[PDB]
Write an enzyme that holds these catalytic residues in place. Sequence first.
Site, PDB file in Angstrom:
ATOM      1  N   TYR A   7       0.032  -2.418 -11.613  1.00 28.13           N
ATOM      2  CA  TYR A   7       0.374  -1.593 -10.444  1.00 28.13           C
ATOM      3  C   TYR A   7      -0.544  -1.928  -9.262  1.00 28.13           C
ATOM      4  CZ  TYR A   7       2.299   2.525  -8.094  1.00 28.13           C
ATOM      5  OH  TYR A   7       2.958   3.370  -7.223  1.00 28.13           O
ATOM      6  N   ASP A  60      19.371  -2.512  -8.471  1.00 28.92           N
ATOM      7  CA  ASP A  60      18.000  -2.699  -8.929  1.00 28.92           C
ATOM      8  C   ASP A  60      17.311  -3.598  -7.904  1.00 28.92           C
ATOM      9  OD1 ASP A  60      15.692  -4.045 -10.302  1.00 28.92           O
ATOM     10  OD2 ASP A  60      16.407  -2.962 -12.066  1.00 28.92           O
TER      11      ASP A  60
END
Lengths: 250, 250, 251, 251
Positions: free
Chosen positions: A154, A61
Amino acid sequence: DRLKGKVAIVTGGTLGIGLAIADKFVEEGAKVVITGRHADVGEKAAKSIGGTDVIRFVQHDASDEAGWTKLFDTTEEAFGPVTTVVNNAGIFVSKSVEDTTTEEWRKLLSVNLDGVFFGTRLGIQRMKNKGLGASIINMSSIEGFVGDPTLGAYNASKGAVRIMSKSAALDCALKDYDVRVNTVHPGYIKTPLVDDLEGAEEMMSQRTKTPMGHIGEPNDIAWICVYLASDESKFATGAEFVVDGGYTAQ
Amino acid sequence: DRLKGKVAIVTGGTLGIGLAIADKFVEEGAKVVITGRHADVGEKAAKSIGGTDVIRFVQHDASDEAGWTKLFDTTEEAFGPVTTVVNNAGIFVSKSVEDTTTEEWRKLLSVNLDGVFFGTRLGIQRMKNKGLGASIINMSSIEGFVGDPTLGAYNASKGAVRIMSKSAALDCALKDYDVRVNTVHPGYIKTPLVDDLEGAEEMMSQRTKTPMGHIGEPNDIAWICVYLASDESKFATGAEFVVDGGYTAQ
Amino acid sequence: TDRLKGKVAIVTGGTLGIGLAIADKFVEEGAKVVITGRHADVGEKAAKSIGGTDVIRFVQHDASDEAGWTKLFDTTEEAFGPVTTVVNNAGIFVSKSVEDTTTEEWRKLLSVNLDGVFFGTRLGIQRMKNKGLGASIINMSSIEGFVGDPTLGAYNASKGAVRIMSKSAALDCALKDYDVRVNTVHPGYIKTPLVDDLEGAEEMMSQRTKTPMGHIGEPNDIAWICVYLASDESKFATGAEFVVDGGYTAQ
Amino acid sequence: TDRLKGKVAIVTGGTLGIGLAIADKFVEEGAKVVITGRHADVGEKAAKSIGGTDVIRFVQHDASDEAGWTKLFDTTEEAFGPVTTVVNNAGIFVSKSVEDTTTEEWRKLLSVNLDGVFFGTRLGIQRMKNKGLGASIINMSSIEGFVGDPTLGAYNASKGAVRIMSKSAALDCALKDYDVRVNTVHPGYIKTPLVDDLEGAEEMMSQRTKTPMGHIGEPNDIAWICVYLASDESKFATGAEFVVDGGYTAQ
Ligand SMILES: [Mg+2]
Ligand SMILES: [Mg+2]
Ligand SMILES: [Mg+2]
Ligand SMILES: [Mg+2]
């Protein structure tokens, strides 16, 4: 063989854009380590491209800081010193700023921002001064240039990546590290994310969004990344490469 | 009275740029609440501008999410509904990306990014649909436009603020919230931070940096903020206002 | 393995420096190329220096010659087939502040750097649209299309005009499904014959306050991004700006 | 309380729309103003509509008239004292794609929108430098100086040229301590007499895909950022771009 001798880490390289980057890197003679959160998916993706002599999977990750060290060491033990880092791993949240929970904000930024920082920081440390023609390629987006009312976190993450990469690019240049840092800015690309969001491709293909009237394909991003990875782009650093079907030109 | 009827929250308003914003807002008829981490400093700053009928201090760290609610409520109880939010609070770290500790990265982003998010998010919720001619003014920097090799985390934070503000601006516009969101981008300004960094003003005043050959003053930023706060700027949203002595023009 | 198989390119000011390297690498990648220049002896020699007449030819032309553009397209088509690629690279330099720029200097520079790019773009669209050629128009701007230079007033004006006008053309072609893409390339300081003639020029350009890498680029640095833009590799890139400048604009 | 005390401004194309509102608010803030326009009846009426001859006057002038610029400065100085402020607002519109633009249309638009802005900037620098006037040159670009429009090819070219050329002039003045600042203003869609004459124009501009606020602006929206740029409030702002566009460029 445009990437002969290159050794690349491609984060989130098991699907979509990252997978295509890995595919075309191997095609151009690079050795590649791809990362992903899911082992079954990751192992299958690697094999779909080639054997362990040219590509390998490492379960990771991008927000796992300590794992980044294991990622560089494992890639080096396999293929030799890393020359290329593509910080492509990321997640998507569809919320306005107004509607973004603090949990969502933190989760997204930890992968899309911290993860890219971790990869860039360690990348500079491990590749500087080794004469590798090193290249760090940070995946931003058109969302690093313009706002989207439903992509607050985002937007924040991609704008951060956009400018932080310039800082890293200047430091490497000024110190003669032989490391270049650039950002790639995809528009809407046909990816597993897009396919899974009902109505997404339709909204994206409107002429008011993408002037070409259709969304891209993962190879569209792969080829600009091959360029930035290769010594062809040895005078390019701190710059922004946009492949978006015209989205930001209007 | 260019800000007649306006009610403003100015974060980090007890020193430097924030203090000047507060000063000129009060001068133009706004009511102001300034925040800061230090009570003695904060109380003195407020009184230096005016009485409790026009300005008040609230002790608050911009990264304190829960405190933001107390900040809006206290400002409303004092002066009436908030119309203006200036997310100015922030910290400075002088490290390359390569040399940035994860502790430094997180600390800086928690104030410079999370704090601005907290203020913007709550600002939209509390000011939308009230016909206030609301204005959210997010303090970026020239460092939101260009890299600096020794300001990696700062660069990341300012680029994030730059683009995240566009998202918020579009959402508010498209939903007819009567809230505008804009970013201000100071170049080098004579502030307590600059005065305290030995050699900083000298490096900043080089013609290769600031073409005017000197750094700015806090009022230079105050006046552009008065503009964005006033109804004079009612058609301006999602835009970037740069006051930098020419730094980014070259 | 050729990245430009089947392409037919016109490269203006292709007899020296950046233009020459573009043409060189274009031919290397399987394109057929016509280069233009003002001087025939140099130009014919430049063409032969790259390859045979079956892949590269010279045509004497000034980019500000509007009528000549039609001859340029016709001559190139007659030799190699329908044009697929246009590189508007020709330009001139004037070193004057806005304050110190004569109107004659202003008009002369703009006629080549702006009008010529316009002529090539306009005719390129008319001649290449709807033919399914994977057509690409590559307009040479510069770092001076992004930032000002106090001693390059007219140059700044011309390069900013090219930067935005190209977006207009890119949008129209996209919206009409013309199969023509339009993009701009923005070189920083490149080692070219002009730079070589200016004593001390390279030294000043190589200062870290100017070019962070501490050296200036080479014409091949521009050639390779142009190969990318010319190739079908870049079929989703249009209306965008590609900067190769050693970090000049990042600070 | 006047924000423009002592300023003396030339506003080109100041007899209608955006230019008129700039002049109006300039006079309101204590400046003396000369407005220019091509038509005398309209222009003289426009001047009187704002105030008396002690604060505003009309001068018949086409911004592409180079020689006329000297008369414009001399006439303004003789009436009000040394010019401190220049607003290059005059311009024309052509609605053609790059593909469809005639060279006559190209040249005519550029002569006003580019050459005229150049003439005003160049002469502005020569006439206002070193006089300690807090001088300010305000060049009217547009959202079309940032992004393309498929139907505004020449306009895009002109507005991008103005955007970057202004940075050059801004840098030279700063580096020389000229006490002249140069900045660009970028209006989005504004309700102007041109827009009023185009049926349906306002409706199209007000679509959310165009202007996110869902309505177009008013000339006063441009006037107030120009007051800021003209005033000593903005003494540290130069070479920058000020966009007032209802969110057009943010998406
Ligand atoms: Mg060759
Ligand atoms: Mg710069
Ligand atoms: Mg009036
Ligand atoms: Mg847009």
